[PDB]
Amino acid sequence: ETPVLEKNNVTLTGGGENVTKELKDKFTSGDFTVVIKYNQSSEKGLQALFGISNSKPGQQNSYVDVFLRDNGELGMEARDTSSNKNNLVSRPASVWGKYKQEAVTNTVAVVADSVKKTYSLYANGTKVVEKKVDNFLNIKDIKGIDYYMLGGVKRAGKTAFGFNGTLENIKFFNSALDEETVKKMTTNAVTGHLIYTANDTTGSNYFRIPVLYTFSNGRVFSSIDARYGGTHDFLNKINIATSYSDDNGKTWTKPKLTLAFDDFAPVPLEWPREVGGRDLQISGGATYIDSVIVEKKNKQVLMFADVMPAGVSFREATRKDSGYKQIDGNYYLKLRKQGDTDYNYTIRENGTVYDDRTNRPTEFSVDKNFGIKQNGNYLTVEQYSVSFENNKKTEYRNGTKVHMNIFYKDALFKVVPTNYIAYISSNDHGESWSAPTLLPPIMGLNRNAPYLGPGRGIIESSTGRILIPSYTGKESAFIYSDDNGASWKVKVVPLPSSWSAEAQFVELSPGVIQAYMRTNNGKIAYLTSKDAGTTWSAPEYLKFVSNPSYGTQLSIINYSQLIDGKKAVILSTPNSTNGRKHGQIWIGLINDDNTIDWRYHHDVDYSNYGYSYSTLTELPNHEIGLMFEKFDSWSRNELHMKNVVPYITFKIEDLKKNL
Ligand SMILES: CC(=O)N[C@H]1[C@H]([C@H](O)[C@H](O)CO)O[C@@](O)(C(=O)O)C[C@@H]1O
Questions:
Q1: Second label for 647, Cα 20 to 30 Å away, from 157, 223, 295, 355?
Q2: From ligand 1's centre to the CA of 14, what distance in Å?
Q3: What residue stretches are annotated with the Sialidase domain (predicted)?
Q4: 187 and 229 housed in the same domain
């Protein structure tokens, strides 16, 4: 199947190029596919990569185009003046702008298929949207088309939406090419920056909350939320997926499901993005959410995550019950048997379920992965699948039998409906993992567990104390161990307001650590401890970041090499009052007095491009790895998008900019 027109290396600065002679009436059926490999010299303004129009006076609403906005949105219009049909199909955060001071080459495409009445858009190997529209228009359906141009749309004799950049290759086909063909044709260097991809070995269409960590042996390890029912925090099904690289981030393993429940199948779901429909959630599967990684002194790796029973949201989790009882000085996870109103049971030694009323063992036991047995035999429940089609979400028992689990809605014995924290450990640097351990009720018996601050933990150098950042909604909770992770304690620090205080730590000098965190006031806060985390200062605030009141997670790390003769820290955060946008990486140099000279920054892409949760690591070669949400993950307009969490590498010289 061959193009009706192909052009190469057309450099434009807003004025466009007429190709009317070379396209006139070639779109015989009216269907079309246009594949455009381009880079932009300037991202400002609404820019059309091509335009097919009626250029006559009064016919300015008779055109087809593919467009780019200054926030990375890719779209198309197909409009006819006399029928008054105006189609616009798009997705935010579809393209890249610039990377390391150079324009990025993207390959995008549009397919219009009259038989299906769908428009489809592709960007860098991903079909970003396909939408069926009742008012479908093909080229033949638009009256009096007389002008075909590159890099603009001719409207009433004037060039609209002028493109600034180079069309490296543009191909026009007079038919609807098939999806696999167009995915391949749009695949390029940008595609290779995705570690996790929609419907890869995780089965998830969507991801959020990336974490990077470099282990002592040189392995670069990642974890992430695989969020199956769109990108909603809750209600959803979420697993923690992992992937690693043993060549300094150049190649990565096929993702694995590392923390996952099986009450719901991990399946690819087409979550709706329309107003209204996008608020849809599933009934809720048992969930792991928001991972934290640390490597211990002995090279064992710990991963922590929040644990939510099926159907329980952060918002409805009870705050007044830990889910534990204390019996004879020991903390045991408590259970309510279906039909009871009280929690009459506890999981004691060897997972044996005791009746607390009689203080005797029952026939039931719970294994280390939370599965329920009766008389030594597993109880089972039927797994749920979720499906769509006719714009209708259906959940149903799917014929698969899985072990009954205390976190599931169909369990005979159930935990308190609140949030918990679990950790797992690995002795082979992430290739295999232990069973989970739930944290004991370190906040007290009558409080829920803290919520983890996604990213990493640290080992403070002078004491060997392990620190894990978390928060409660009104306090900071610095979880810690002084016995190399055998047992855990917490320092609870009240905050000026009800911050979602996702935090990360850095060590300035031995015994001196700072916790940088999200607030509800627009600023990034930092608290300082001079006794390895036992006591903390009042908050201070970075002066150079100004964000919206909701705030965003951040990443900050220590860096191992001197910069300008000084020890350095590296910070990643959005910096915009208009959304989760304008990502920056900042270098902070530690002064002799333990203040920080925030001397350099580098903008990640253009300032209106999306940038939400992020994670930094120092690669073994002392380059910097970054993985981030390249979209606004707060915005109700950017929910449920595929293939938007990339990985990029920087040298320090790429970062040492702007002073
Ligand atoms: C892709 C897009 O947004 N297109 C819309 C444009 C632009 O918003 C403005 O021209 C600002 O550039 O405005 C219209 O009023 C127009 O020109 O007819 C409606 C059209 O659908």
A1: 295
A2: 17
A3: 418-621
A4: no
CB of 67 closer than 6 angstroms to any ligand 1 atom = yes
Alpha helix ranges (H) inside 202-315: none
* 11: enclosing H helix or E strand: strand 5-13
Cβ neighbours of residue 534 closer than 8 Å, sequence gap 6 or more:
491
How far from chain centre, in Å, is Cα 495?
27
Contact 346, 337 (CB under 8 A): no
49 and 106, same domain (yes or no): yes
First to last CA, the chain: 53
7: left (phi over 0), alpha (psi -120 to 50) or beta: beta
* Whether residue 290 is found in the same domain as residue 261: yes
DSSP character at residue 652? H
CB 541 within 8 A of CB 525: yes
Q: Which atom of ligand 1 is nearest to the CA of 65?
A: 1
SS3 20: helix
Question: Which mutation among 43, 44, 46 tests ligand 1's pocket best, with the greatest number of atoms within 8 A of CB?
Answer: 46
Residue 57: other Cβ atoms inside 10 A: 9
Supply the residue whose CA is at minimum distance from atom 11 of ligand 1: 46
The residue segments making up the domain with residue 26 are: 1-191
Distance in angstroms (rounded) separating the CA atoms of residues 285 and 235: 8
CATH for 655: 2.120.10.10
For ligand 1, atom 15: residue with the closest CA: 61
| 652 phi, psi to nearest 5 deg | -60, -35
Distance 78 CA to ligand 1 centre (A): 12
**Residue in the block written with tokens 């400002």:** 44
Phi/psi zone of residue 510: left (φ > 0), alpha (ψ -120 to 50 degrees), beta?
beta
Structure-determination technique: X-ray
Residues 121 and 262 in one domain: no
Active site residues: 233, 502, 613
Of the candidates 168, 144, 159, the residue with the CA atom closest to the CA atom of residue 56: 144
Q: Report the distance separating Cα 175 and Cα 32, nearest Å.
A: 5
Report the nearest atom of ligand 1 relative to the CA of 75.
Answer: 1
User: 63: Cβ below 6 Å to ligand 1?
Assistant: no
Q: Which atom of ligand 1 is nearest to the CA of 90?
A: 1
Same domain, 474 and 618: yes
Header resolution in angstroms: 2.0
Q: Are residues 413 and 447 in the same domain?
A: no
- Can you say how many angstroms the Cα of residue 380 is from the centroid of all Cα atoms in its chain? 33
Residue from 64, 77, 87, 158 to probe ligand 1 pocket by mutation (most atoms less than 8 Å from CB):
77
Q: Are 109 and 124 in contact (CB under 8 A)?
A: no
Residue 239's beta-bridge partner residues? 226
